[PDB]
Amino acid sequence: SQKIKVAGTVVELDGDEMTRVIWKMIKEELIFPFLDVPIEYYDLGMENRDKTDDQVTVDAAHAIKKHGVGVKCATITPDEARVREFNLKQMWKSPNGTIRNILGGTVFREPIMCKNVPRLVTTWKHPIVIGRHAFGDQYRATDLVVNGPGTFEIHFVPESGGAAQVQKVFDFKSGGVLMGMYNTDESIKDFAKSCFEYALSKKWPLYLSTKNTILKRYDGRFKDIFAEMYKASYEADYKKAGIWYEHRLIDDMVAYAMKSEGGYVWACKNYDGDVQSDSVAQGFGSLGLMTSVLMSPDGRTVEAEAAHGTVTRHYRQHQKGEETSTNPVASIFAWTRGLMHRGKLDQNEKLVQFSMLLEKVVVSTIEAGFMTKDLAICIKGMNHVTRSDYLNTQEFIHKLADEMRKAYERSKI
């Protein structure tokens, strides 16, 4: 089904469980009818990441860097329960963590605002953008079970060959756990750049959260890198733009974030950008109401995703042959932002107007009273929602399609 021709190639990464089911329908009804789109397909379904030894994940990452745009459905990350469940050869790493490792950059997350959906948090008047650092820390770590007594040490061995630098971290008297993790100056700096630059262009303030009182040298490095770069390259233009940058302790930032009105960029270390960008997304209404875009330092490569998970409890219900009502908006906006970036790379204005148009139609369709259960909950009580207040997953997508077909037909005479 072709209409708008797209020269560029979109690298699509398929995922798992309920999101995989919605992914198919989104392609089927919202994208392909309108777009003549070259798709380099990569199945990051869990079975296929097992079949290929996770190499499908690595190749997909590399294919995104080549073509410039990636669009990824939520995937399962496996632990022991999951290894059992699929008879996996191993506990494979988060495909997300692997993609992010290879690409680098920053994951910008923002709520998708629907005026008829009450925010959960009375104070939040404006959107918060989270710049989550995509590299290192707890997401590329080495952890270990300890089985008996013994001493946990770190050796740093320099390249020159000067002697080993060792630290006794802990004497274990019994079983326990240990782990090491890292970050790089180079990375933190790209993470500083893109955050400073995004807030400069939104004309908004920038907060950095760390726990540099505790991790004096580790988090300390982030604080100093951001402060050094601010003085050097952003203070003058920030002060001229009527905005400001400040380091705040993670403690104080979450309290501020909860009570403030929004209108600022909040830069988080990896883990905080993981946790808080869900607290935020649910605060604004639902996990399905959020964009998530991994951006290059150079602005040429974009991996757009849904930030939420595979919606396992909903899939278990879909698998019984029971009805589901799962919010597909975050999956759809993975596509639109990917296609928007695709069109920017190609000098293709038609593609950008389509991407924007699909975002308008989703938001407008929700705004006109047509919505999945989770948004109906935001409006009507937790226990005072009924079947007539919301559309199921299929209907919602169907309604969305009806509207998109109509809007597109009218759109560019």
Ligand X SMILES: NC(=O)c1ccc[n+]([C@@H]2O[C@H](COP(=O)([O-])OP(=O)(O)OC[C@H]3O[C@@H](n4cnc5c(N)ncnc54)[C@H](OP(=O)(O)O)[C@@H]3O)[C@@H](O)[C@H]2O)c1
Residue 197 per-residue DSSP state: H
Q: 236 contacts which partner out of Ca ion, a second copy, ligand X, none, CB within 5 to 8 A by kind?
A: none
Give me the least distance between CB of 412 and a second copy, in Å please: 39
| Annotated binding-site residue? 233 | no
252 lies in the binding site for ligand X (CB under 6 A): yes
| Annotated binding-site residue? 337 | no
| Annotated binding-site residue? 306 | yes
Asked if 364 and 106 touch (Cβ cutoff 8 Å), the reply is no
| Annotated binding-site residue? 52 | no
**CB closer to ligand X, 26 vs 307:** 307
CA distances from 240 to 123, 225, 237, 257, 404 (A): 28, 22, 5, 25, 42
Give me the least distance between CB of 370 and a second copy, in Å please: 21
320 CB-contact burial (10 Å; exposed 0-12 / middle 13-18 / buried 19+): exposed
Spatial distance between the Cα atoms of 48 and 44, rounded to a whole number of angstroms: 6
Q: 91 contacts which partner out of Ca ion, ligand X, a second copy, none, CB within 5 to 8 A by kind?
A: a second copy
Find the helix or strand (DSSP H, E) in which 53 lies.
none
**CB closer to ligand X, 124 vs 408:** 124
| Annotated binding-site residue? 327 | yes
Q: 177 contacts which partner out of ligand X, a second copy, Ca ion, none, CB within 5 to 8 A by kind?
A: a second copy
251 lies in the binding site for Ca ion (CB under 5 A): yes
Question: Of 57-96, which residues contact ligand X (CB under 6 A)?
Answer: 74-77, 96
**CB closer to ligand X, 194 vs 210:** 210
| Annotated binding-site residue? 76 | yes
Q: 299 contacts which partner out of Ca ion, ligand X, a second copy, none, CB within 5 to 8 A by kind?
A: none
The dihedral over CA atoms of 28, 388, 362, 367, expressed in degrees to the nearest 10, equals: 170
x-marked contacts with ligand X along 373-392 as a string, rule CB under 6 A: -x------------------
Spatial distance between the Cα atoms of 276 and 296, rounded to a whole number of angstroms: 22
Q: Hunting for tokens 């009570």 — which residue is that? A: 259
At 134, list the tokens. Answer: 């995509």
271 lies in the binding site for Ca ion (CB under 5 A): no
Spatial distance between the Cα atoms of 299 and 297, rounded to a whole number of angstroms: 6
Residue whose C-alpha is closest to residue 240's, from 180, 267, 200, 192? 200
| Annotated binding-site residue? 95 | yes
Q: How many CA atoms lie within 13 Å of 412's alpha carbon, on the beta-carbon side?
A: 11
Burial 293-302 (b: 16+ CB within 10 A, else e): bbbbbeeebb
Give me the least distance between CB of 66 and a second copy, in Å please: 23
**CB closer to Ca ion, 111 vs 343:** 111
274 lies in the binding site for Ca ion (CB under 5 A): yes
Q: 205 contacts which partner out of a second copy, ligand X, Ca ion, none, CB within 5 to 8 A by kind?
A: none
Asked if 127 and 110 touch (Cβ cutoff 8 Å), the reply is yes
Give me the least distance between CB of 249 and a second copy, in Å please: 8
φ/ψ of 366, rounded to 5, equals -65, -50
| Annotated binding-site residue? 241 | no
Q: Which residues contact 24 (CB under 8 A, 6 or more apart)?
A: none
| Interface contacts to Ca ion, rule CB under 5 A | 251, 274, 278
| Interface contacts to ligand X, rule CB under 6 A | 74-77, 96, 213, 249, 251-252, 255, 287-288, 305-313, 326-327, 330, 374
Binding residue numbers for Mn(2+): 251, 274
